[PDB]
Design a binder for these strands. Structure first.
Lengths: 63, 247, 228, 60, 143
RNA sequence: UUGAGAGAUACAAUUUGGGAAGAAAUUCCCAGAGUGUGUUUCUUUUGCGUUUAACCUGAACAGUCUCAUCGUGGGCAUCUUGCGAUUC
């Protein structure tokens, strides 16, 4: 009884390992669907450091 | 305790010594366990403050350098009543090279306190401005987006200007501070003015800055220190090093 | 290196190697009938392409009472080009028999060659809707598959099942909505054909939408009780 | 109130519920199936009768 | 003409080598599964687990459904990290087949447009509204 | 801002079942389902103003001769830096 249940659990774990995936699941989902179907300038990389932190209160206030 | 005690000591030494009175800025120098792999350009890299503002555009004169034509830029900026009182002077690069050389150039250097230009002109800027500006980080030319609009390959760009966006940039900049990457363990940043604020504000600013620099996030901008940070020294322009966070 | 594993139904196997694939055990080995690939492990094997055989898509789609068994007699309407009928022959094995039916010609000759290679095949080259020209040769099928685009699917099944399907028999049909209606939703068409068979003495047990493999087909499976 | 009573009425009339990826629905009654040809198509009746109730003839 | 030949030959290469890669590759079945019940009480009491005589993940997984009695992977080399990555590897590999395929299709199409431009007739150049060139030939039966 | 429908959800609470742990109380795992709230999807209706509307075509690009395609020479790096593409 309980031994049979334990064997069931063990072999189920075996099959699950054979067919396992955690996030490759969604990744391969997107890939299979496709198969079956910020700011950045290109010429100055120096801009990504050069830019400033836009700040909502910093526009809103009339100080 | 060491921090604010050394702060009091350096203050009193400033008001006693003649020249230490004359230099007017607090600087902190971080020595890191590892060097930085970022070769020194002059791109002004800025760091945000979560708590306390430092300088105000209302308090500071300012220079803007446009692209070449500059007609619509200048007239729009001076007209939209959000910058007419804000930008002290506006000049194009060619006109600047036509107007200032040598003596008059360093005359400018003495006059203005903070300058900025278009991010499509920043890299050209040095030779027309001079190594004389290009020392330290006091009058290091900044870099502001001017259009809030982007370029695409094989697509002509269109040029605009909006006071809301540009004024946001300026206010953000004077609210927070900046730095410049090096290739060794020693990087320096100005932190606060000697009377605009207080020791608790100093310590808050220091803690926020160190947290930003050590933060794993914002790696393109903030996650730049390599290895375990060694220590932080404090000074003014001519004082001596004072130690903080030795390990 | 390659791992074999059995499926819920007999004869169906999945290979877990560098890949995972659907496969059957060749009685005739090393002779790939339509350029399909193969694998050995020793014994031989032969792969299915679901994209080419509708029933294969159903196998992967999951079906409990798919009455086609190794030790069984199965009738095969819509046997064309011999592929899927060769597969069902191979899954029923030597003791099982597959009564294939066709009415085109060129797939007829191809199926002739396929029979010339396999014994479990038995080809019939006759009218789909005139089941006499094979009543006199077919006897007591226990399980029937049909993939036919003649919109009288319900008729042809009803006729040949009354003449051939032993009681409590198994029936399975492929339906092309774009073939029979092409205007109203495939769900509606599927349901409609369901009560069609329901009246035509099929107890409808299940149906699979063949969604991610073919456009707009349903496989319907039912049983056949107290009928004749 | 009467709304939720109508809703649970429709529930106790519906013969199709969803069970995860599986979907469940009945097999209708043989007596009804023999004594009555299936009901008509609301879409098509609305089509033709609206057509007779077209607004080009001043049916008003 | 020779450039067209070269490109189209590469396109055929990639196309059918794609079709082979797919035919050996496998997808996952996502199709609807509606069950027939003859009584509303059986509807309510339904459980796929008992209707299948299987377990939870066996019920949820689609293409392989083995019952408890049917039941009654370390040989796979580090499957938790290896075989999954190689499966995604094959899927990717097919992906760049197909995208390279479409890119070459476009190249060949535009280049045959240019050939036609060259051949013969009474052409006409129109700038279509989104700003894209096209050519139309006067109604004329070539002798 | 007519009803009604279908559906997607999200949130919240409610519960269906299999396994396991548990003396048990309980807990775990797993697939769930519905309720309500927020969100949006989509359908029809209801009423209202309103006769056209889009595309195609016939001898329809071309005297400031248009168009194609190889080559040469220059502009735009303060950047359309130019794809077997059509930068000017």
């Amino acid at each position: 009884r309980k031994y049979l249940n334990k064997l069931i659990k063990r072999n189920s774990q075996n099959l699950r390992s054979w067919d396992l995936e955690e996030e490759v699941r969604d990744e391969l989902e997107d890939i299979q669907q496709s198969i079956l179907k910020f700011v950045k300038d290109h010429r100055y990389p120096g801009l990504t450091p050069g830019l400033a932190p836009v700040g909502l209160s910093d526009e809103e206030d009339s100080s | 305790g060491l921090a604010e005690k050394a702060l009091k000591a350096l203050i009193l030494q400033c008001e006693e010594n003649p020249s230490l009175k004359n230099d007017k800025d607090i600087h902190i120098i971080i020595n890191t366990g590892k060097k930085m792999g970022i070769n020194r350009d002059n791109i002004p890299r800025i760091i945000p403050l979560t708590k306390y503002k430092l300088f105000k555009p209302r308090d500071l004169n300012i220079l803007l350098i446009t692209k070449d034509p500059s007609a619509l830029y200048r007239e729009t900026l001076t007209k939209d009543e959000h910058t007419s009182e804000l930008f002290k002077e506006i000049i194009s690069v060619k006109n600047l090279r036509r107007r200032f050389k040598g003596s008059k150039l360093t005359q400018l250097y003495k006059d203005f306190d903070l300058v900025v230009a278009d991010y499509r002109v920043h890299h050209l800027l040095p030779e027309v401005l001079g190594s004389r500006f290009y020392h330290g980080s006091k009058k290091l030319p900044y870099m502001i987006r001017m259009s809030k609009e982007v370029k695409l390959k094989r697509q002509q760009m269109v040029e605009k200007c909006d006071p809301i966006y540009v004024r946001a940039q300026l206010r953000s900049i004077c609210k927070n501070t900046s730095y410049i990457p090096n290739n060794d363990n020693c990087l320096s940043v100005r932190v606060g003015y000697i009377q605009k604020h207080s020791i608790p504000e100093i310590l808050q600013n220091i803690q926020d800055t160190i947290n930003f620099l050590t933060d794993k996030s914002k790696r393109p901008q903030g996650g730049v220190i390599k290895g375990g940070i060694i220590s932080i020294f404090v000074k003014t322009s001519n004082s001596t090093s004072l130690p903080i966070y030795q390990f | 290196k390659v791992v074999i594993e059995p499926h819920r139904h007999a004869g169906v196997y999945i290979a877990r190697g560098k890949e995972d694939l659907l496969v059957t055990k060749n009685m005739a080995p090393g002779e790939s009938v339509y350029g399909e690939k193969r694998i050995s492990v020793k014994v031989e094997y032969r792969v299915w392409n679901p994209f080419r055989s509708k029933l294969a898509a159903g196998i992967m789609g999951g079906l409990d009472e798919l009455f086609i068994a190794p030790g069984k007699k199965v009738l095969y309407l819509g046997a064309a080009s011999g592929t899927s009928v060769s597969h069902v022959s191979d899954v029923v094995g030597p003791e099982g028999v597959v009564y294939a039916v066709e009415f085109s010609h060129r797939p007829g000759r191809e199926l002739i060659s396929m029979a010339k290679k396999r014994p479990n095949i038995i080809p019939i080259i006759e009218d789909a809707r005139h089941p006499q020209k094979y009543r006199m040769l077919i006897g007591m099928v226990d399980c029937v598959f049909a993939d036919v685009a003649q919109p009288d699917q319900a008729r042809i099944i009803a006729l040949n099942s009354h003449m051939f399907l032993k009681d409590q028999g198994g029936v399975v049909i492929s339906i092309k909505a774009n073939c029979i209606d092409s205007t109203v939703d495939a769900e509606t068409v599927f349901a409609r054909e369901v009560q069609k068979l329901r009246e035509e003495r099929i107890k409808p047990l299940e149906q699979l939408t063949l969604e991610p493999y073919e456009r707009d087909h349903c496989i319907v499976v039912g049983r056949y009780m107290r009928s004749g | 109130i009467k709304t939720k009573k109508r809703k649970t009425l429709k529930n106790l009339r519906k013969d199709s519920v969803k069970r995860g990826k599986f979907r469940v629905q009945l097999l209708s009654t043989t007596q009804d199936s023999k004594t009555l040809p299936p009901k008509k198509e609301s879409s098509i009746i609305r089509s033709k009768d609206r057509w007779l109730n077209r607004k080009a003839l001043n049916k008003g | 003409t020779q450039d067209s030949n070269y490109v189209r030959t590469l396109r055929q290469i990639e196309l059918k080598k794609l079709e082979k890669g797919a035919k050996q590759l496998m997808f996952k079945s996502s199709g609807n599964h509606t069950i027939f019940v003859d009584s509303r009480e059986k509807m309510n009491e339904f459980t796929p687990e008992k209707f299948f005589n299987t377990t939870s993940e066996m019920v949820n997984r689609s293409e392989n459904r083995l019952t408890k009695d049917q039941l009654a992977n370390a040989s796979s080399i580090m499957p938790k990290e290896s075989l999954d990555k190689k499966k995604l590897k094959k899927f990717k590999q097919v992906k760049q087949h197909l995208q390279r395929e479409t890119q070459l299709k476009q190249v060949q199409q535009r280049m045959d447009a240019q050939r036609e431009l060259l051949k013969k007739g009474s052409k006409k150049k129109i700038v279509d509204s989104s700003g894209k060139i096209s050519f139309k030939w006067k109604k004329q039966r070539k002798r």
